[PDB]
Amino acid sequence: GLASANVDFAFSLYKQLVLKAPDKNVIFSPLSISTALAFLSLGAHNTTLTEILKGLKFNLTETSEAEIHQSFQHLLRTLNQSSDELQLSMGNAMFVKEQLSLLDRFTEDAKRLYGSEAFATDFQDSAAAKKLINDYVKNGTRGKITDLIKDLDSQTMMVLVNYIFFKAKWEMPFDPQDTHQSRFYLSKKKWVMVPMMSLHHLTIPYFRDEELSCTVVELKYTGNASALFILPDQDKMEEVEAMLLPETLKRWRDSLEFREIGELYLPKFSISRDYNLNDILLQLGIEEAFTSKADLSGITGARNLAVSQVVHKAVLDVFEEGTEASRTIVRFNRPFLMIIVPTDTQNIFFMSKVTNPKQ
Template identity: 35%
Template sequence: MFFFLSSLPELFVTVNRQPRGRICFSFLWVEGGRRGPCNPTAFAMEQLSTANTRFALDLFHTLNEKNPTGNIFISPISISSALAMVFLGTRGTTAAQVSKAFYFNTVEEIHSRFQSLNADINKRGAPYILKLANRLYGEKTYNFLPEFLASTQKMYGAELTSVDFQHASEDARKVINEWVKGQTEGKIPELLVTGVVDNMTKLVLVNAIYFKGNWQEKFMKEATADASFRLNKKDTKTVKMMYQKKKFPYGYIQDLKCRVLELPYQGEELSMVILLPDDIEDESTGLKKMEEQLTLEKLHEWTKRENLALIEVNVHLPRFKLEESYNLNSHLAHLGVEDLFNSKADLSGMSGARDLFISKIVHKSFVEVNEEGTEAAAATAGIATFCMLMPEENFRADHPFIFFIRHNPSTNILFLGRLSSP
């Protein structure tokens, strides 16, 4: 099984039969109020946000271990949503491993919560474009359990399209790619490369998310100029540095010597939040200390609105575009999802038989940040000490930083990244 995710995130999953079949799943992809005893739905949605964020940070740390200095960009909500659909078809130990790694076991009625989140994400009339779409492409001669197909359609809006993988796998691949291309406004033109699906493929599940939003406060193009971006203590590169001076939510974490800036998109339901160290103090990107302390509790503490002040900020932010691709098998195995990728897999909830396993999960992501906004396809007590702020602050992102795009009503992280080299 392949997962291919792009952020625009997209995830493609292929499940192999033992020994003769393969199912492909392809996915592309992303404040709660205080919960009260009389609002169980809000409580459950907060549980989902917490689960998704914990997984996002776990995966970020795992990717960072393999790539401690390079760019990282993922759509954790896309991966979680995709695996939630897979979770519908898992049983036994396989289900337990997926549930634990993605923290699904901490959320009541997990699939209903994803259903609600998808509806919230896809709502109409917003001043930005944010859409999440799912579709199943199944081998026309293979019998999937009606219950599995009904659940994916009801909870995730994933309708089944029958295709002929057995005799025309290349044509089927092109059909899938065209659908993905349309859903991502052309940003993911070829999710599935030649050879990814073949005559043994049984199912491709596609989850696509696309986001395009304009800044609440745009950067003026005439203010953009060439500037040096410090990759580390020794190396620099020239970038197009944007600039504006406006009032933004801003904070400073004294313990980490780190600045926090929130850049809202129009409508303020979505924001980009940037964590920027004062300087490069280690021998790599300057982010090591922050990354070591990056937990759910601390991230919430660092970035929640109550700890930020709306003040004048001189913002210098590089124009950048990232396109990343990951094979997630080893990373998810590191997080405890092991049986899914071999003959031990129990995906009998999909077909009624234990003859399927996931052969590969690939996640692709794309993001572009410029003066207008962002386009992306493809989320403890005493943890921080904040200091008093000056009436005006400087935020010069001319060295590596961590950023994420947050869906503020649900607090879900749609996209998460580290910019080491624009």
């Protein structure tokens, strides 16, 4: 039940992000954002929890919030049970105002269920608070993400931080010695220089949608997950987005057939963007938690705090041998989509839109 809900929440979020940036590169981790939203919900009460759960398409008449938290904990445990071949490390955390005492029980619950940890933050002199949070997140990851918080307003009650960095290896690793510097077409007559990677005489799932005007190819990773690449035709990406639904993702994954594709070309890009989810989540359907009426009695027990900044950065590398690199012709010289899902169940690890690989 959690899979479809996560897909729907992720995809509405992606639609809103596109609405806020029609052509800019889009990258975000659906699983991390959903987990952070549930982490925020862990301290919610009254109608704030029901509003946070109206998002992500949770039908509360059937599924309760406790089962949702249990399912999230189970998913995190399963992901952390994976071996070194595939690792998806996400470590989102929430920062609390130091002038108001945090709840010890909530800290224990966060540590035991979502693995996140929270502490009092010296938000006085926010110029120093930016340095503190940046140092914390730099110590957290190995160094993938830096300068996560762009700025902090004076006397911000709360900030929510969500970060992720994928680490996987292609099932069919690209040969670095065959990487060619070719042209990537921004538009009909606009192109930019970016390296692309090539293969030959390989068999991957492939589907051409003659009724949706797009091409989808599946590239799998050495672990239990895989990636979906979507290559819409020229001047048809908006139609693809308009007719893009989980109803379509289901059909795509149930219509992936192996094909003897001659050559496949994929850009060598490592997208990395930060996203402030204030207005995005406000338009998504959660509003009460941001306007000094959060009623987050689980956080401290005094409803005196509201979330002010939900800033997310999802970093990801598409290189020859996966992250941190050391017949039918398919060429990704056009703006294209990217969906990363496990094969066993539908759940979007990463959803991306690439338009200008140079940036």
